[PDB]
Design a protein around this nucleic acid. Structure first.
Lengths: 97, 95, 98, 407, 353
RNA sequence: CGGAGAGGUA
DNA sequence: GGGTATTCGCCGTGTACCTCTCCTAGCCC
DNA sequence: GGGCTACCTCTCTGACGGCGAATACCC
């Protein structure tokens, strides 16, 4: 739900968007690309990899950094997936429960 | 006879990767033609290249900056696209 | 705050948790080692699905060349796929009681 | 492989040529997309040309499209502009290449010809702002001499206001008087008598049927803009014309501009503190420079701009524009509506017509015969003088025989 | 399932097929047009699309277009190789569109005076200048009936924007043609949309070599609509042109003057210098119940020699030289008494000489 | 109504 | 047939409090 | 400078406590 992942209404036009909203944005980007790529009947060599790009996009959405190179933010900082908000010392259990 | 392969970086860099690729070809003096599909956009960063698969060319396609390389079954050998699919994208490239 | 939404994916995908659970739930369920499961899901190899009357195995793994080679002598009942749909179809073809 | 050559080819040949190259079916395609597709397939050298329009970058507009922004414009990098000191109006002709992956316009590699001349002659040149202006010295006679019935309009124009090189006149005429037929007779006479001069017809905010009529009637270049286009294009077209004209004069060329929308052009700048009539204080400054740009160069070349002003149009704004530009030029050719209602063509007001410093274009005996003719025409009325002039000019073919019989 | 309608491409890329009986109004049962089919056939706004449709599935609210069968009352193979309206070369009026009935009826007197004063041809762009309560309704019906009687092949479209509903039903049940209107019961947003759907449909027919004649009695009303929501109405008026490659577009509009508002005067003064035909009507002759109350001196047509012969132009010139010295009422009484002696204008010309 | 890093206190 | 011997990353990081900083601009247009 | 939408470079932050475990080494 959007209230559980809001933005940062700071003073200005820029927004330090949440890592989850950025991840959901990338998945929709990589999905609408694949949805259009199939109606055009593109070659398999493109559909095959683009599904892998979609595959590696959902994995970061669920649990980023576990498979391999963690999808970073701007330059260095990694992004918090859905697992990071429940796993660890900063999860809901050991920080809010 | 030259075959078709896909030069693939992180999706989005179709534009400048080819301008440097053509210029890198004329410096090394095995490469037929690189096409750009577009509409009035499919393959958001996947470029089809007419070339032959050689050990020297394997490093050349990886020596161009701002690119990952070929994608296939393993990093040992790249995977071709198809014989009929090249004609399929060629038809949609015109029409 | 208390209602959600969904997204219709253009292609099925696998869950990273069950894929890398240590031990992998997907792995030991199909007797398939995790070493090649990563290549199948990430579109890096092939797996047989309902081979039929041929010299193949139920869950044999074969590369691109072996895919093309086997297609030459067997291209009627031979059926190999790659990605999450291949394993998804393999999951539905599996049986519990047997 | 030239751009202008493929633009002149018909659509049937372009579709047939494209099908032989193995491309998309060119039936459901635009002509510009057809040429763009042929250039790509043929490049897998290409040459082009056009007038430069510097924005730091710029493009090469085409003359057949009235300098409109098209997809086939050749991109000009600012590095080449800073290297050759190129400006807006310089004709550039060189090798071009199709746009690569991620590009949308043709790029310029090497320039071959600058302003229809070698680049070594354009790098060293005197600017138009430094040329010394002068009065009209060379005589641009408008009389045909073939004895045609349409030559009477040119014969009266020569006796009323002789036109020379670098002349900046005004054609004052109310609407529905015959400005269209008068402009055609002038343009046809210029192309017939002086075919070496560069004739340019500018029609801003006019009817499309009139645009295609003038384009297929006069022997020259026709750059026009219909009323369906906003005032922004009217300003851009006017600037591209005056910039190209200045560059030609800098190369010692005789440029002739037959303007027919000086009133419409002023409305264009006024649209893009309010005085009497709805005219802005800084709105007439731009048409003022565009009009006064006409001048005679002593080093070589000239610039002639003949504008047609609109009066009695029912709008007070046009009256202020006309009254301000009245004291700007040095030639006024007034037309009478009362004579036009009588179907007496041409309906020229010979009384208020005239040219300052007319002795620099006519001989001593010719100026005296014109002076005596005016002293006989002035006492008679406007309609009576035209009927007298037409009946006397119809008896002979040349104006010399008419003056000989008056004495 | 078969359907039909005029295409209206939205700004987002897709479009719908409006209905003709609803005066091009957005309905809940409109046929959705996918952008893929628009790119396939190069369809634009105004193209009459008729083909197979299907009911909406779960999650849809419009009928999807599966396959188009007929485009602009023609095969798609003939509409794919066409010339755009922006590339057509305009020309002056060449063909003569005679309005005279020829039956010798008293209703033909309006058309007879109109032919002697302002001959109308193909591609004409004129204005019917008339104050309120001058006879614009009766004059319009006489023109529409004369066109359907003399030239039944021409497509007559009477677009009435911001008018009375009872007058719309009266005109639709009287003239022989298509009648699209948009009453004042709805805001100017629909007035602009209906006006665009008509001009787009008209341009497509001209591209298909058709002679479209539009009698728009709302150029004053349409100008107020754009001013509430002169660049747009001027392009709509100037769209009328005679195409050399084939077809023509004639737009006869009625301007409103002396309506008590200075805004209409500026609109009339600006559009006066655009067209090439002005048919002024006198209020004094209209209040005297003398129809048609046409101001013969104020009327006229530029380049009339391209629509009339040499002898016909001379007779009209001699007629004007006699009518001009006489007054407005005296000229009408003279003209009516001379035209009542015979039935056709040929006998009138023979008696004047 | 944030995320990392640095320093300090018990 | 399996019972140990490498190996390469893999999850185990005391509590609370205070101060301060850093935060994306890339490409042909 | 930027508008929709591209554009960086690095995998096998490195230790230890060890732990079941994929691979591998004999018993």
């Amino acid at each position: 739900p959007p209230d559980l992942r809001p933005l940062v209404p700071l003073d200005g036009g820029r927004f330090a968007t949440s890592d989850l909203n950025d991840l959901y944005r990338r998945v929709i980007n990589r999905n609408n690309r694949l949805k259009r790529l199939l109606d055009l009947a593109a070659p398999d060599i493109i559909v095959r990899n683009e599904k892998r790009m979609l595959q590696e996009a959902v994995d970061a959405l669920l649990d980023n950094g576990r498979r391999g190179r963690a999808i970073t933010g701007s330059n260095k900082r990694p992004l918090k997936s859905l697992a990071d908000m429940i796993k660890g010392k900063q999860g809901r259990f050991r920080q809010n429960l | 006879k030259k075959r078709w392969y896909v030069v693939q970086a992180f999706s989005g860099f179709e534009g400048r990767v080819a301008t440097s690729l053509r210029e890198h070809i004329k410096l090394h003096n095995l490469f037929g033609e690189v096409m750009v599909p577009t509409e009035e956009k499919f393959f958001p960063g996947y470029v089809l290249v007419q070339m032959v698969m050689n050990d020297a060319s394997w490093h050349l396609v990886r020596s161009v900056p701002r690119v990952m390389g070929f994608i296939g079954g393993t990093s040992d050998r790249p995977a071709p696209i198809s014989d009929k699919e090249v004609d399929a994208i060629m038809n949609r490239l015109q029409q | 705050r208390e209602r959600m939404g969904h997204i219709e994916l253009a292609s099925p995908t696998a869950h990273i948790w069950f894929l890398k659970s240590l031990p992998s739930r997907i792995g030991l369920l199909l007797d398939m080692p995790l070493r090649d499961i990563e290549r199948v899901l990430y579109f890096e190899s092939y797996v047989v699905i309902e081979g039929g009357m041929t010299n193949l195995e139920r869950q044999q793994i074969l590369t691109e060349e072996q895919y093309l080679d086997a297609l030459e002598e067997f291209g009627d009942e031979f059926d190999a796929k790659m990605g999450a749909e291949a394993i998804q179809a393999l999951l539905k073809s599996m049986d519990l009681e047997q | 492989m030239n751009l202008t050559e493929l633009k002149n080819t018909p659509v049937s040949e372009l579709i047939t040529l494209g099908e032989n190259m193995g491309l998309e079916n060119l039936a459901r395609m635009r002509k510009q997309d057809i040429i763009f597709a042929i250039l790509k397939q043929h490049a897998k050298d290409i040459f082009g040309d056009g007038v430069l329009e510097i924005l730091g970058f710029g493009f090469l507009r085409s003359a057949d499209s009235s300098y409109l922004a098209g997809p086939d414009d050749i991109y000009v990098s600012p590095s080449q502009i800073r290297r050759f000191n190129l400006r807006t109006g310089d004709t550039i002709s060189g090798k071009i290449r199709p746009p690569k992956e991620g590009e949308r316009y043709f790029a310029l590699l090497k320039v071959n010809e600058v302003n229809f001349d070698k680049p070594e002659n354009a790098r060293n040149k005197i600017l138009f702002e430094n040329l010394t202006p002068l009065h009209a010295n060379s005589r641009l006679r408008m009389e045909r001499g073939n004895g045609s019935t349409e030559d009477l309009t040119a014969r009266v124009l020569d006796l009323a206001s002789p036109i020379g090189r670098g002349q900046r006149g005004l054609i004052v005429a109310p609407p529905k008087a015959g400005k269209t037929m008068l402009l055609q007779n002038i343009a046809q006479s210029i192309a017939y008598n002086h075919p070496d001069c560069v004739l340019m017809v500018l029609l801003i905010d006019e009817r499309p049927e009139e645009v295609t009529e003038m384009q297929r009637l006069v022997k020259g270049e026709v750059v026009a803009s219909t009323f369906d286009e906003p005032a922004s294009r009217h300003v851009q077209v006017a600037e591209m014309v005056i910039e190209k004209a200045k560059r030609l004069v800098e190369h010692k060329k005789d440029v002739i501009i037959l303007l027919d929308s000086i009133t419409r052009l002023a409305r264009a700048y006024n649209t893009v503190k309010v005085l009497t009539g709805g005219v802005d204080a800084n709105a007439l400054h731009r048409p003022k420079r565009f009009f006064g740009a006409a001048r005679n160069v002593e080093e070589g070349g000239s610039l002639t701009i003949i504008a047609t002003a609109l009066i009695d149009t029912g709008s007070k704004m046009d009256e202020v524009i006309y009254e301000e530009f009245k004291g700007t030029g040095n030639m006024e050719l007034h037309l009478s509506r009362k004579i036009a209602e009588k179907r007496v063509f041409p309906a020229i007001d010979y009384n208020r017509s005239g040219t300052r410093k007319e002795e620099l274009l006519t001989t001593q005996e010719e100026l005296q015969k014109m002076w005596i003719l005016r002293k006989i025409i002035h006492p008679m009325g406007e309609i009576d003088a035209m009927e007298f002039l037409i009946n006397k000019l119809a008896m002979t073919k040349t104006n010399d025989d008419f003056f000989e019989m008056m004495k």
